[PDB]
Design a protein around this ligand. Structure first.
Ligand SMILES: O=c1ccn([C@@H]2O[C@H](COP(=O)(O)O)[C@@H](O)[C@H]2O)c(=O)[nH]1
Ligand SMILES: O=c1ccn([C@@H]2O[C@H](COP(=O)(O)O)[C@@H](O)[C@H]2O)c(=O)[nH]1
Lengths: 218, 217
């Protein structure tokens, strides 16, 4: 599995190139893994991935929550890996064929797929939660090794961990801004994803240092 | 939304030259183009303005938005800023995530299309069993534009039943995925067609044939 420095992944969702670069560079010493999503990519272009690689020695996870039909998923994955992303996050709710398509491209292109089972926001309780256990089981049966679960619902994250086993890799968003706690989340997740709590702080570096200090024993 | 010939082109080619050429070859048959991530992540969001400059067509961004509320807002804002007239949003992530999109849409005067049931086989695993409730949620939220599967006419019909004849409904899955143009239009206001057109040796003739087959409607 990827070796995430300090078990902390930066969710760089600022939508300005200069601000995104400035902030990421300031926390550079505490993180070696950055999660880039559509807010930044649709504002600055996929070339932002290469720029982060050039400026920082950071691993890139594209949080695109792929959720299309199989054929389209393949194209999305190919475009994303061509851009230099190390891994891509895919939605499990659209079913096995859609996930398999992503795994096929990842295998062919030598990259990784992360399966998003249950989401962290309140609305996730409406339809995703009830299917999350089966989505995880589906992922396990498909050979998925990397997963995404909610920091906001410890009991759910714990169940996800059980389903995928200790060997699987698990990252979890919803820490900070959404209410999740760093330490509690790392009881089940291999690494935590943190966005606003860091990038909106007056001193992003200090915010990141503070989070790491709080989980030092972990 | 008045879609010419009730036909929406799914422009999923990933080369700017090919996408513009093919879209130009069928420009006389359509005035509505659906652009998605295959093209946008390969050529950039500036491609939307290029399409408007060269064709003037309306643009539907099929981004199947499926993030948390906060991030959905950012995605829609970025998308409408690029010139998209509408954006397709997944309903599976819940009401708050859909409302987030509706908020930005209202603020920027654009439209949100709610995707309720997908057209591929995998949609049967988790999406289908929640589809009716997702459509009802859309109605409660005041959504007026929807996306349903051409590949399952009975499901498309149920979707139409739930949203009413006043709501607008578009449907992908025509051609490549097995859906029939005419049967789909029995329930949907417009059909979405990608490969059956853009992969054809002669795209223009392909579009003309599809339109010819539905001249009655
Ligand atoms: O269930 C999920 C999956 C992914 N994210 C993503 O993780 C980040 C959380 O950011 P923040 O709340 O720390 O600012 C965002 O990029 C968001 O899109 C969630 O928050 N919830
Ligand atoms: O349930 C859905 C929702 C959207 N699309 C989209 O509609 C187009 C269908 O293209 P094609 O099968 O006509 O080539 C693609 O852009 C695809 O991503 C589907 O096929 N199924």
């Amino acid at each position: 599995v990827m070796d995430v420095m300090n078990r902390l992944i930066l969710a760089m969702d600022l939508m300005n190139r200069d601000d995104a670069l400035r902030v990421t560079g300031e926390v550079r010493e505490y993180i070696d893994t950055v999660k880039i999503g559509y807010p930044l990519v649709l504002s600055e272009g996929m070339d932002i991935i290469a720029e982060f690689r050039k400026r920082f020695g950071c691993r890139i996870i594209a949080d695109f929550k792929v959720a299309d039909i199989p054929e389209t998923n393949e194209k999305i994955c190919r475009a994303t890996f061509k851009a230099g992303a190390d891994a891509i996050i895919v939605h499990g709710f659209p079913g096995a064929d859609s996930v398999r398509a992503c795994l096929n491209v990842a295998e062919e292109m030598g990259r990784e797929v992360f399966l998003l089972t249950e989401m962290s926001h309140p609305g996730a309780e409406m339809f995703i939660q009830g299917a999350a256990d089966e989505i995880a089981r589906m992922g396990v049966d498909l050979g998925v090794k990397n997963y995404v679960g909610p920091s906001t619902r410890p009991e759910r994250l714990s169940r996800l961990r059980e389903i995928i086993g200790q060997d699987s890799f698990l990252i979890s968003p919803g820490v900070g801004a959404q209410g999740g706690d760093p330490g509690e989340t790392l009881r089940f997740a291999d690494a935590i994803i943190v966005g606003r709590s860091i990038y909106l702080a007056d001193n992003p570096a200090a915010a990141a240092a503070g989070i790491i200090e709080s989980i030092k024993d972990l």
